[PDB]
Design a protein around this ligand. Sequence first.
Ligand SMILES: CCCCCCCCCCCC(=O)O
Ligand SMILES: CCCCCCCCCCCC(=O)O
Ligand SMILES: CCCCCCCCCCCC(=O)O
Ligand SMILES: CCCCCCCCCCCC(=O)O
Ligand SMILES: CCCCCCCCCCCC(=O)O
Ligand SMILES: CCCCCCCCCCCC(=O)O
Lengths: 167, 167, 167, 167, 167, 167
Amino acid sequence: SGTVPIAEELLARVLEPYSCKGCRYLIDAQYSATEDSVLAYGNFTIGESAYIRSTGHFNAVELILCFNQLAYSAFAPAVLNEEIRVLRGWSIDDYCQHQLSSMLIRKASSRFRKPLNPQKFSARLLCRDLQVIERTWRYLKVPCVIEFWDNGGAASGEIELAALNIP
Amino acid sequence: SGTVPIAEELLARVLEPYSCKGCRYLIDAQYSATEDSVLAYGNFTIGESAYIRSTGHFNAVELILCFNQLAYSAFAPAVLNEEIRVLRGWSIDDYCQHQLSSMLIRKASSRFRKPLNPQKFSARLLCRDLQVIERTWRYLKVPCVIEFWDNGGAASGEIELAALNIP
Amino acid sequence: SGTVPIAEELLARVLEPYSCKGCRYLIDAQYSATEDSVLAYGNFTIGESAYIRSTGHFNAVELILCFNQLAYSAFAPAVLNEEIRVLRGWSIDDYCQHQLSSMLIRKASSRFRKPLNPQKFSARLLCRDLQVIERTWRYLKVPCVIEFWDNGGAASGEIELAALNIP
Amino acid sequence: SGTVPIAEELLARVLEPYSCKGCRYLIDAQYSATEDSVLAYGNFTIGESAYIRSTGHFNAVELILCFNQLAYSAFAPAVLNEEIRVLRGWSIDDYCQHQLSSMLIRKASSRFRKPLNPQKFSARLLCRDLQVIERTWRYLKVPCVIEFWDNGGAASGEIELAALNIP
Amino acid sequence: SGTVPIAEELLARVLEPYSCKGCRYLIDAQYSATEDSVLAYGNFTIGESAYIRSTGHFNAVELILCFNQLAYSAFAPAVLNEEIRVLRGWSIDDYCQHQLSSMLIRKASSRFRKPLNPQKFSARLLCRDLQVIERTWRYLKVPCVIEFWDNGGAASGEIELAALNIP
Amino acid sequence: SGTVPIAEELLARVLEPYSCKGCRYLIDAQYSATEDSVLAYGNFTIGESAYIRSTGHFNAVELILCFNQLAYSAFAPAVLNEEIRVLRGWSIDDYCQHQLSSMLIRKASSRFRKPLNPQKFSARLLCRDLQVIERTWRYLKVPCVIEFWDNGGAASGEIELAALNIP
Ligand SMILES: CCCCCCCCCCCC(=O)O
Ligand SMILES: CCCCCCCCCCCC(=O)O
Ligand SMILES: CCCCCCCCCCCC(=O)O
Ligand SMILES: CCCCCCCCCCCC(=O)O
Ligand SMILES: CCCCCCCCCCCC(=O)O
Ligand SMILES: CCCCCCCCCCCC(=O)O
C-alpha cells in the first residue's frame, strides 16, 4: 500500500452532498499521492438503496456511487497538502465548490463477477497520468482504475473523469 | 422505427420500485419485438437526484437508472404478448416477481459528449442475440445498446444483462 | 490478486493430454482476465518424472511442463466467458481442438535459484500485450511472465507463445 | 568439425535414465574436447512424447530433453579419456553417479523458427569457458550453446549448467 | 516479493566504509535482479547520529544514508552472480573498488510523512531502466525508487545515480 | 546582495550540535531579512566525512548538511533582531531550544552538475512565502531555494521545511 488514512470530517465535508441524502456509503479511506497519481482504499456499507425498493444485492448504480465517493475523497487530502502538481492553485475550498458541477464521467467500463455484499465491502482506486486539456472546454482528464471485493465477490472499472475548472 | 406504444400502468406497474421512491424518470415508451430482439424508445425527465444534492446536469448514475427503466419497460409488453421465444413460459406475473433480484448488469460501457438536459431527454434501445446460458447459474444473457439525446447532447452504452430465472 | 478460481473438470478437460499420460501436475488454479491480459496462479505436485529415472529435484523440463499447464488452464475460462477480445469467436470447443497442434513456444528465458520442491510448489503467471500477427502464418503472439516458489526456492521465465488459428 | 565418434554403449550407459523410460532420443553422437571445451554433434528421433498426447511437432520440452542427452553424452568420453582438466579426478564412474542429482540448468535461452521434424533431426553443441565456482555450493559452471536442424527448420539456445560435485 | 536474502559479510564488506565509522544502519537485506532491474528490501536501526547531537527523530541525511547502503548492498550480489547485463565485466572486486569515488547521486526527490522511528525501520528499493551513457563522462545511469516505513511512518524518493566506470 | 554579516559565536552557538561532532562546515555567513523572507550566503569547507571513509568529492548528504547549517544560521539573526513577523515571540533562546527536535525537512529536490570541491565552496540561500499552518500539527512552513558553487561546479535544491513550535 504505502498509504496514510484520511480524516473523517474532511470526508464528511467532501461527501456531505451524499450524506444530506443518506447516501454516503464510504466508511473510511486511506490515500497516497504523487505529482501525478493518487491511490486510495475505502470501506463501504449500503443501508438501503435511495432510488429502488430493495434488490438485496449490489447494483451498478452503487458501484458508480461508491467510485464517486472514493475519488471525491481520495483527491481531497491530495489537494489540501497540495501534492497534485496540476492542481496546486486550488485550495480545498476550491475543490469543494467544484465538486457537483465541475467533475464529470466522460467514459467508463464496468465488469461484474461474484455479487458484492452491499453490507461490508471494500475498494482499491488508482488514478494515473492526469493531464490537462485546453480547448472549447479546459479540463483535467483523470484516467481511473477501481476494483471492489468483500463471502467472495468482485467488480471493476476503468473510468475517465473530466474536472472542469482548474488549475 | 416500426414500434407500438406501451401502456402506462403496465409501465407504472413495472417501474413502481422506482416510483415508490420518486425515481421513475421514464415518461412514456414505445417498443417493437421479435423471436430474439427488442427495440424501445423512451422520453424522460429528472426532477431531482435522489442520491446527491444537485449537480445541475445529467450524471452517469442516471444514465444507468434510465437504461434500467427502459429495458425493464421494453421487455414487459414483449413478455406479455409472449413475443420473446426464450421467455415464453413467463407470464408478466413472472417477470415482475424477477425484476429486482433476478436481473443484473454483467458488464457495461459508457460514452459521454454534450451533457444531456436532465429535464427533457430521450433514449433509443436495442437488445439483440439474446441467448440462454446454463451452468452454475442459468441465465438469459442480454446484449444491449442504448443512445440518449435532447440543445444538443448525447451519451451511449453497450451493456450486457443477465436475467436469472427463466425460461 | 483479484482472481476467481477455475473449475476442475474444465481443467481436467484442458489438461487431459497430460493426465491420460499421468503428467498433470497442476492441482488447482485461479485466474483473472481483461480485453488483453490474463493473470493466473496454480498449485502443483510432481509424483514422478515421466521421462527420466529420478532426479530428486525440479528440472527445467518440468518448469516448462508446468507453465504449459497453467497457461493452457488460465486461458480456458477467459475464452469461455469470452473475456479475451482478440479470441472472441473461439468457443471453448475451438480452444480445446487447437491446444496440441496450434499453440507454440517461440522464444523463452529461464532463471533458477533455490531448487524447487517438486512435491508442493506454486506459480504466478501473467500474459500481457497479446497481439495478432498476420502473414505467412497468422498467429496471436502471447508474451508471458511466470514465477515459481514453495523450504524456499524460486524460478522464473519470460516465454513468448504463438497460437496458430484464431480469431 | 574435427570430431571423433562416441561409442554407443557408453551412450547407452549414460542415457539409461531416459532409455529405461523409452525417452532416449539421441541416436549417435560425435565429440571433440580440450582442457576447457567440448563440441558435440548428434542425430535424433522422437517416437512419441512421454508426457503429452501427440502434438505432431517438436516442442520446447524436447529441445531441452535433447540438449541434456547430448551434453550428458558429449562429456562422457571427455571425462573418460580425462581430456577436461577441471574434471580430472572423476572417473567415468564418478560421472554416471552424479548425472541425475548433481547436474543442473541454472539459466537458459531458447529461440524457435521453422518447426523441427521430431522424426529425423540433428544438433550441434558447444560448451566453453568452463570454470569452477567455490562457495555455499561448489560447482563447475558450464556455458553451453546448441543449435538444431533437419524440410528446413531450426532452433537454438544458450544454456548454463551447474555440475555439483567435482573436481 | 520474489527476493533472495544477501549474505552478511558480503554486506559487511560492501558497507565497511560506513561501519569503520559506526555508520552502518542496514541490518540485513534481500534482493532480486534481472538483465536490467534490481529490487531490494532492508531492515535498519540508527544508534546515534554521527554528525549532529541528537534530534530524537529520522532526518533527511539518514534517509540518504540508508538509500546508499541499500543500493550499495542490493547491487553487490547482482554483480557477483553477474545478473546485471550492462555490468557483466565487473567482478565484485571491481564493484568494491568503485564504490566511494565512482558512484554518485545526480538528482533526487524526497517526501516525508509520519516521522520514521530511527530505531526499527525498513525500506523497499527498486532501480529500473538502467542505461549506459557515453560522452565527456561515460556512466551507467540508474533511476531508483525507494520507500520507508516502520507506530506508522513513511518517506520516499526518486533518486537518479551515476556510476562512473563500467562496463 | 544587500546583506549584512552574521557574528561567529551566534553561528558557533547555533551550529554547536554539529561542532561538538566536528561537523560544522559553514565558515561564515551573511544574511538579509524581511517580514516574510530570508536571504543568506555562506562559505564552507569539509575536512573529512563523519559518516563514510573518504569519497574525495562532495556527496548529497553534505549538500543537505550544509543547507541545514546555513538555514539554521540565516534564521538566527532574523529571529534575534525580530525581523521575521510570524516568528516574533521567539527570543533567540526559543530558537536554539527548537533546533534539533522542532525543525524538519518535509520534501526536497536536488540537482547535481560539476562536482563541488568539498574544500572551498559557497552557497546562496533564499526562503520565501513563509506561512503558518494550524492543525494536527501547527507548523511554520518554509519554502527554500539554495545553490552551491566553487574549478567550476554547481548543485541546487528546493527544500521545504516545517518548524514545529512557534509563533
Ligand atoms: C480534480 C479531480 C477530481 C477527482 C474527483 C472527482 C470524481 C467525481 C466523479 C464524478 C461524480 C459525478 O458525476 O457526480
Ligand atoms: C428478461 C430480460 C430482462 C430485461 C430487463 C432487465 C433490465 C434490468 C436492468 C438491471 C437493473 C438493476 O440492476 O437493478
Ligand atoms: C490462445 C492462447 C493460448 C495460450 C495457452 C497456450 C500455452 C500452451 C503452451 C505451449 C504448449 C506446447 O508447446 O505443447
Ligand atoms: C560435468 C559437466 C556435466 C555436463 C553434462 C550435464 C548436462 C545435464 C543437463 C541437466 C539435465 C537435468 O537437469 O536433468
Ligand atoms: C553500478 C550501480 C551502483 C549502484 C549502487 C551505488 C549507490 C551508491 C549511492 C551513492 C553513494 C554516495 O554518494 O556516496
Ligand atoms: C523557524 C525556521 C527555522 C529555519 C531553520 C531550520 C532549518 C533546519 C533544517 C532541518 C535540520 C534537520 O533536519 O536536522
